[PDB]
Amino acid sequence: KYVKVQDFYDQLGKYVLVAPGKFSGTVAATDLSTGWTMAWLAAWNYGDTCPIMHHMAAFPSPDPYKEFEFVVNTQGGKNLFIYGVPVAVEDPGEGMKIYRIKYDGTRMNLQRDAAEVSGLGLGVHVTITPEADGYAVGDGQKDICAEFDRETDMVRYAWAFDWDPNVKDLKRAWLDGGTMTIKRLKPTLPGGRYDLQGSKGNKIDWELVPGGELAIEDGKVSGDRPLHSVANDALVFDPRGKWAVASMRLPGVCVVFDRENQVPVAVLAGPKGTPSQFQLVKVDDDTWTVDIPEVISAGHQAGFSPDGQSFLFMNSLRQNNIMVWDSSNHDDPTTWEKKAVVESPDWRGAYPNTFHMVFTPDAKKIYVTMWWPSPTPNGIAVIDAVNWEVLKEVDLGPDMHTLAITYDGKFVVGTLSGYQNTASAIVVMETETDEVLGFLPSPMGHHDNVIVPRTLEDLRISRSTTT
């Protein structure tokens, strides 16, 4: 007549949860079928002076418990001053590192820093290619994103984004529109290397915090080049191959990239009432532009349903909803048209924001995150992806972040992360009747979490297609 916590985990199946801990310094693999941490890694170990450990993604493995590979980045610079911790390192390391890490069935071995190898340092999202032959990072202080080869860790293409405001005052620089340029970067050092590790190429001094467009507008984000920010956040991929979509927060657009031919081919328009798309203009071999008349809202979260037949981009703060296109046509992104929009009283005021999402395998539902600043209950809301409405919402706790799903599609498993100073959990939730089965210790402030995929098809619902 005593309850064994093992009974809990029995129901979860043979999956491996991984997560980085932001100010914690750590990355951690957990075995849901038992409750142990398989392994963990403290990057201070490795002389890293600002081991803000940030986004990660993992390669599909035939047996994750035997071995698997992952990628996880870091932030530095004025990133350390932007949470509520009264940190003491006045002058931190710059981060912007792209670690390569293998769990080999025992432990995690630090393989290298990919930004030393390539010479390109990025510190926001990391995704895996749908072929698992590579991976991608985005970045929001230097506004560059990049697809990298898995073996060589060299950049396959990088794309810089620059904002030229119609009205040259922070106060109107986005609202009153302008023109963004899409700039094909090229190595500048010998052996195909870039010169962009670290705070090198930062337009601003931290990635924007949520509703941070208000902040930079008000002159409150230090950097050399803020009038020039577009704030890239991600680079995600088409389950079907060929395409990748770069996400730009502040001009609320997404730009569709021909990966093999390395060219941009469409710019998807975020805010409800806009067209489907803005017009891509080519200046030369390495420079396109887009004309944005005004910026009604900033965007954040972007990605594809698992069969790629639907593209999503979330409007946040000024508007709060899910903007949705028909990406059905795989041969031609310029034809992707607005298909629906998901609104709800759930999105009450400026907050909550919806920054993260995972689908079900069967592209019928999505679980999406609800973020408030403290103390407002953060939670999950569940999306009917066939009719496009909110089914329900569940309150959970402080500072919701990412979500992942078991590959059998059974349990959702997210990380709540105490605003880097308070309560942090793993949350489990069953897809069947959308009940919160409850929480597991997690003394880390996760901005990322995945479950190790086995198959290429598993990826389609992992950090590849969404963030």
Residue numbering of the annotated binding site for Cu(2+): 7, 22, 54-55, 90, 112, 125, 153, 207, 228, 233, 300, 316, 330-331, 356, 399, 401, 447
Indicate the helix (H) or strand (E) that contains 117. Answer: helix 114-118
Is 40 a binding residue for a copy of itself by CB under 8 A? The answer is yes
Give the x-and-dash track for 392-431 against Cu ion (CB under 5 A).
----------------------------------------
Decide if 325 contacts 333 (C-beta within 8 A).
no
Give the x-and-dash track for 162-201 against a copy of itself (CB under 8 A).
----------------------------------------
Decide if 210 contacts 371 (C-beta within 8 A).
yes
Is 319 a binding residue for a copy of itself by CB under 8 A? The answer is no
- Whichever of 128 and 416 has its CB closer to a copy of itself, that residue is 416
Is 418 a binding residue for a copy of itself by CB under 8 A? The answer is yes
Residues forming a β-bridge with 288: 182, 282
Which one of 72, 82, 358, 426 is in contact with a copy of itself (CB under 8 A)? 426
> Which positions ≥6 away from 193 have C-beta within 8 Å?
118, 119, 187
Amino acid code (one letter) for 279: Q
How far is Cα 417 from Cα 421, in angstroms, rounded to an integer?
Answer: 8
Is 82 a binding residue for a copy of itself by CB under 8 A? The answer is no
Which one of 85, 189, 283, 386 is in contact with a copy of itself (CB under 8 A)? 85
Which one of 276, 335, 376, 421 is in contact with a copy of itself (CB under 8 A)? 421
How far is Cα 426 from Cα 21, in angstroms, rounded to an integer?
Answer: 12
- Whichever of 92 and 119 has its CB closer to Cu ion, that residue is 92
Backbone angles phi, psi at 324, to 5 degrees: -130, 130
**# residues near Cu ion by CB under 5 A:** 2
77 vs 90, 113, 114, 116, 119, CA distance in Å?
Answer: 9, 18, 19, 17, 18
Indicate the helix (H) or strand (E) that contains 458. Answer: helix 456-459
Is 39 a binding residue for a copy of itself by CB under 8 A? The answer is yes
Is 211 a binding residue for a copy of itself by CB under 8 A? The answer is no
Burial call 372-396: b when 16+ CB within 10 Å, e when fewer: beeeeebbbbbbebeebebeebbeb
Site for Cu ion in 206-265 (CB under 5 A): 233
Q: Which residues bind a copy of itself (CB under 8 A)?
A: 1-11, 21, 23-26, 28, 30, 34-40, 42, 44-47, 51, 80, 84-90, 106-110, 397, 416, 418, 421-426, 428, 430, 432-433, 435, 437-445
